[PDB]
Design a protein around this nucleic acid. Structure first.
Length: 187
DNA sequence: GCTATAAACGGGCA
DNA sequence: TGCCCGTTTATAGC
């Protein structure tokens, strides 16, 4: 384990990637839904052709403007790969699709400090960052400021980390919270 | 299933 | 304007 960005020795698994990209062409979603078998289009419910591929297991959202969203991938490149696959499926249907302005929009990762946490004690000494109402949701909602990352901390020691645009913020935010979570170990 | 979280999207509606 | 819906994913306690 690389103990330079991970002094803890713990590495958050990335669990979901959300990305955008501009096909930079106007599209007929009604037509796309007809010749593609992989596509569902409910213009009332959501003005988007919803498309999926098996590897990388992803779901895409394709809007007439030409903007496209890709979700479900386990990493940044994996997400890019899927978006490339979707853009080419579109090209194959006779549309001047390109691959303009690809952007990693959100990283979601999870990890495990491997010990229980007193969520109340954590929520009590960090009132400015925390939000813990275990009747609505069993997880503490910790909005870190540097970096601006949102952590979801639980009793078991399992942790969700979201709102990251670079995977180093996913890693930094956890590293920031680890010596805090040890402070409130549940014995 | 709903409860919560981040984020892109575009149509709809107060 | 703004807010919802829309998709995905870890988490887990009703």
């Amino acid at each position: 384990v690389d103990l330079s960005k991970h002094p803890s020795g713990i590495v958050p698994t990335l669990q979901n990637i959300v990305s955008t990209v501009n096909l930079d062409c106007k599209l007929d979603l009604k037509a796309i839904a007809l010749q593609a078998r992989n596509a569902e289009y409910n213009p009332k419910r959501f003005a988007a052709v919803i498309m999926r591929i098996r590897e990388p297991k992803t779901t895409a959202l394709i809007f007439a403007s030409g903007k496209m969203v890709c979700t479900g991938a386990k990493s940044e490149d994996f997400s890019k790969m899927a978006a490339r696959k979707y853009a080419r499926i579109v090209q194959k249907l006779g549309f001047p699709a390109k691959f303009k302005d690809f952007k990693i929009q959100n990283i979601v990762g999870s990890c495990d400090v491997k010990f229980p946490i007193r969520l109340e004690g954590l929520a009590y000494s960090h009132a400015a960052f925390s939000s813990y109402e275990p009747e609505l949701f069993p997880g503490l909602i910790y909005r870190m400021k540097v970096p601006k990352i949102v952590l979801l901390i639980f009793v078991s020691g399992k942790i969700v980390i979201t709102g990251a645009k670079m995977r180093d913020e996913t890693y930094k935010a956890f590293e920031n919270i680890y010596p805090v979570l040890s402070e409130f170990r549940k014995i």
